[PDB]
């Protein structure tokens, strides 16, 4: 479906060191393209895709300054939330935030988001309208108030509606070669008698991009979703994905089962059987 630019911030307090650690990663679709880590010596925003290295020093200097500001304020923000929850300075706590723009067919924002979380529970979300906020609890209501007081929703809305989609279109051009081609899965079906009672059939998809994919098993027009084991889609290590679906079948019946593979990069859905 739609292309997207999104940032994932993680601030974690470190009571032993008496400080905090700030991580940023930036994504276009399912492809990481930048990172920051306040523990790196002389910490900078660093490139993590081929296509982003071509940006000039002014691009890296700004993203680095925002990173460092984000890291310094998020240290007090952790201290602020500790206060609202009456928590000890003995414990580590985490503050997450994610935000992005999806790209509508016209060249404008489709959907924009800006959510945060404290120890992995929703804290505040900006609503679809980009004009109001929703708060999870008493602490978050205090934070919601300050944001309203300072007309923060308009600044997020301006960002998501302008700069975010502007640079997302910019980035999809810069890495067109990688971000906008589909890699179909390389597929095969394996056979392992794992007991006396039943033979394991396993349908592999390897080296596919993007992440979205549909694995299913069939037998006489009958779907076997209920019976099959489907592993969590996992990275290949080179910017692609892999997945398998296994199902157990009676000995003698292996060639009666077909695996169905639907992915963006196939001319039309695939149909495999074993040997």
């Amino acid at each position: 479906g739609p292309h997207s630019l999104s940032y994932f911030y993680t601030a974690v307090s470190r009571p032993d060191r008496g400080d905090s650690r700030f991580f940023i990663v930036g994504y276009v679709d399912d492809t990481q393209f930048v990172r920051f880590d306040s523990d790196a010596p002389n910490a900078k925003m660093e490139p993590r895709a081929q296509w982003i290295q071509q940006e000039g020093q002014e691009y890296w200097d700004r993203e680095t300054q925002i990173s460092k500001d984000n890291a310094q304020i998020n240290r007090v923000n952790l201290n602020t939330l500790r206060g609202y929850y009456n928590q000890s300075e003995a414990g580590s706590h985490t503050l997450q935030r994610m935000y992005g723009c999806y790209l509508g067919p016209d060249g404008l924002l489709l959907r924009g988001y800006d959510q945060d979380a404290y120890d992995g529970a929703d804290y505040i979300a900006l609503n679809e309208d980009l004009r109001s906020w929703t708060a999870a609890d008493m602490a978050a209501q205090i934070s919601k108030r300050k944001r309203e007081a300072a007309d923060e929703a308009e600044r997020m809305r301006s960002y998501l509606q302008g700069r975010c989609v502007e640079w997302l279109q910019k980035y999809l051009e810069m890495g067109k070669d990688t971000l906008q081609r589909a890699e179909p899965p390389k597929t095969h079906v394996t056979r392992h008698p794992s007991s006396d009672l039943g033979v394991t059939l396993r349908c592999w998809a390897l080296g596919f991009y993007p992440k979205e994919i549909s694995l299913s098993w069939q037998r006489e027009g009958q779907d076997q979703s209920q019976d099959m084991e489907l592993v969590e889609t996992r990275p290949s290590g080179d910017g692609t994905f892999q997945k398998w679906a296994a199902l157990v079948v009676p000995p003698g019946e292996e060639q009666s089962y077909t695996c169905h593979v639907q992915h963006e990069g196939l001319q039309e859905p695939l149909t495999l059987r074993w040997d």
Binding site: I24, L81, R97, K146, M156, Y159, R163, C164
Partner: peptide, 9 residues
């Protein structure tokens, strides 16, 4: 391109 403006807590 990151957001210049910081949300308050």
């Amino acid at each position: 391109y990151m957001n210049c403006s910081l949300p308050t807590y």
